[PDB]
Design an enzyme around this catalytic site. Structure first.
Site, PDB file in Angstrom:
ATOM      1  N   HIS A 129      43.773  44.633  25.538  1.00  0.00           N
ATOM      2  CA  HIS A 129      44.228  45.197  26.674  1.00  0.00           C
ATOM      3  C   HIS A 129      44.500  44.100  27.606  1.00  0.00           C
ATOM      4  CE1 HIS A 129      42.305  48.745  24.536  1.00  0.00           C
ATOM      5  NE2 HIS A 129      43.817  49.066  24.440  1.00  0.00           N
TER       6      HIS A 129
ATOM      7  N   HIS B 277      37.881  40.848  34.645  1.00  0.00           N
ATOM      8  CA  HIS B 277      38.877  40.887  33.799  1.00  0.00           C
ATOM      9  C   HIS B 277      40.092  40.894  34.759  1.00  0.00           C
ATOM     10  CE1 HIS B 277      38.302  45.004  34.475  1.00  0.00           C
ATOM     11  NE2 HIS B 277      39.614  44.999  34.679  1.00  0.00           N
TER      12      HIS B 277
ATOM     13  N   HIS C 167      44.695  42.106  35.288  1.00  0.00           N
ATOM     14  CA  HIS C 167      45.836  42.753  35.159  1.00  0.00           C
ATOM     15  C   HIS C 167      46.708  41.951  35.706  1.00  0.00           C
ATOM     16  CE1 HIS C 167      43.389  46.449  34.218  1.00  0.00           C
ATOM     17  NE2 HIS C 167      42.760  45.854  35.275  1.00  0.00           N
TER      18      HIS C 167
ATOM     19  N   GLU D 275      47.358  46.175  40.458  1.00  0.00           N
ATOM     20  CA  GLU D 275      47.272  47.544  40.067  1.00  0.00           C
ATOM     21  C   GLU D 275      47.205  48.418  41.637  1.00  0.00           C
ATOM     22  OE1 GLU D 275      43.901  48.271  37.331  1.00  0.00           O
ATOM     23  OE2 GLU D 275      45.608  48.581  35.988  1.00  0.00           O
TER      24      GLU D 275
ATOM     25  N   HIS E 225      39.563  41.929  38.548  1.00  0.00           N
ATOM     26  CA  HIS E 225      38.558  42.901  38.727  1.00  0.00           C
ATOM     27  C   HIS E 225      37.096  42.430  38.357  1.00  0.00           C
ATOM     28  CE1 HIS E 225      41.452  46.417  38.440  1.00  0.00           C
ATOM     29  NE2 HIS E 225      41.618  45.795  39.655  1.00  0.00           N
TER      30      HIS E 225
ATOM     31  N   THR F 108      40.507  51.836  35.857  1.00  0.00           N
ATOM     32  CA  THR F 108      41.673  51.689  35.902  1.00  0.00           C
ATOM     33  C   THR F 108      42.189  51.892  34.470  1.00  0.00           C
ATOM     34  OG1 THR F 108      42.129  49.662  35.965  1.00  0.00           O
ATOM     35  CG2 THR F 108      41.890  51.006  38.012  1.00  0.00           C
ATOM     36  N   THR F 109      41.122  51.858  33.183  1.00  0.00           N
ATOM     37  CA  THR F 109      41.700  52.033  31.844  1.00  0.00           C
ATOM     38  C   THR F 109      41.085  53.271  31.583  1.00  0.00           C
ATOM     39  OG1 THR F 109      40.046  50.478  31.540  1.00  0.00           O
ATOM     40  CG2 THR F 109      42.049  49.705  31.484  1.00  0.00           C
TER      41      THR F 109
END
EC number: 4.2.1.1
Length: 257
Positions: free
Chosen positions: A61, A91, A93, A103, A116, A195-196
């Site tokens: 991901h 991690h 995005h 995000e 994040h 958010t996942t």
């Protein structure tokens, strides 16, 4: 299983994770005109001097930079928080292009990427217990814009070739997350979610106002990662962001005037 495509992406997640349509989902758009300054909010305390990074992981991901969370070594406190939150991982995005990737959004502006830093509330003993609580996690979100290189990011960028595909990890010791922070710790805060998947509604979000700068070359290296495993058809790890969700019955508060 879930991902970011047309057939498995964010609009599909609700079928396996019905909280996806919940009352406190993340991310959200931060409307800067309606976020109210809250003078009762404290400065954030970020204490990362003893942080002990161990490993970087391609989980299919994103990539996760993992920490030893077996003691109070890298903690977040203050701000909107009660008690002490221990760093477990960070991690990112990011987008296929510099015009998307974050995000959270700020007045509908999308940044190139978002970092994040995930922390769990020590009063619940472990991460898995924490995520079952409404105040279980505190996630520090930091926007990335493309401009000057972030020297503190280069060690991460360096290592990504070794974790190209899903399921690959590498030793990643002695990495200092302080080098990923902006100058100011001014923030917005609101109650939300992971958010996942599993999308659990356990997070106090702390989103810094000031973005970091990274170079185009740094971000381009994120976009060479793969969502697929070794020896499978290549599908570039890009656009691994969930779009803004409805704010519903929430207030976003600002730490600054």
């Amino acid at each position: 299983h879930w991902g970011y495509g047309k057939h498995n992406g964010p609009e599909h997640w609700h079928k396996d994770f019905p909280i996806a349509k919940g009352e406190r989902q993340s991310p959200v758009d931060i409307d800067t005109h309606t976020a109210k300054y809250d003078p009762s909010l404290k400065p954030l305390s970020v204490s990362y001097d003893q942080a002990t990074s161990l490993r970087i992981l391609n989980n299919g991901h994103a990539f996760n930079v993992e920490f030893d969370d077996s003691q109070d070594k890298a903690v977040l406190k203050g701000g909107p928080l009660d008690g002490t939150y221990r760093l477990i991982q960070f991690h990112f995005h990011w987008g296929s292009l510099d015009g998307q990737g974050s995000e959270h959004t700020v007045d509908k502006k999308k940044y190139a990427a978002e970092l994040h830093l995930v922390h769990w509330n020590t009063k619940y003993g472990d991460f898995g217990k924490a995520v079952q609580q409404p105040d279980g996690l505190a996630v520090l979100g930091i926007f990335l814009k493309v401009g000057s290189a972030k020297p503190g990011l280069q060690k991460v960028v360096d290592v990504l070739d070794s974790i190209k595909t899903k399921g690959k990890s590498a030793d990643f010791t002695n990495f200092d997350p302080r080098g990923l922070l902006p100058e100011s710790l001014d923030y917005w805060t609101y109650p939300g979610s992971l958010t996942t998947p599993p999308l659990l509604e356990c997070v106090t979000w702390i989103v810094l106002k000031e973005p970091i700068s990274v170079s185009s070359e740094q971000v381009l290296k994120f976009r060479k990662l793969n969502f697929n495993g070794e020896g499978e058809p290549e599908e570039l790890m890009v656009d691994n962001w969930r779009p803004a969700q409805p704010l519903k019955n929430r207030q976003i508060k600002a730490s600054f005037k």
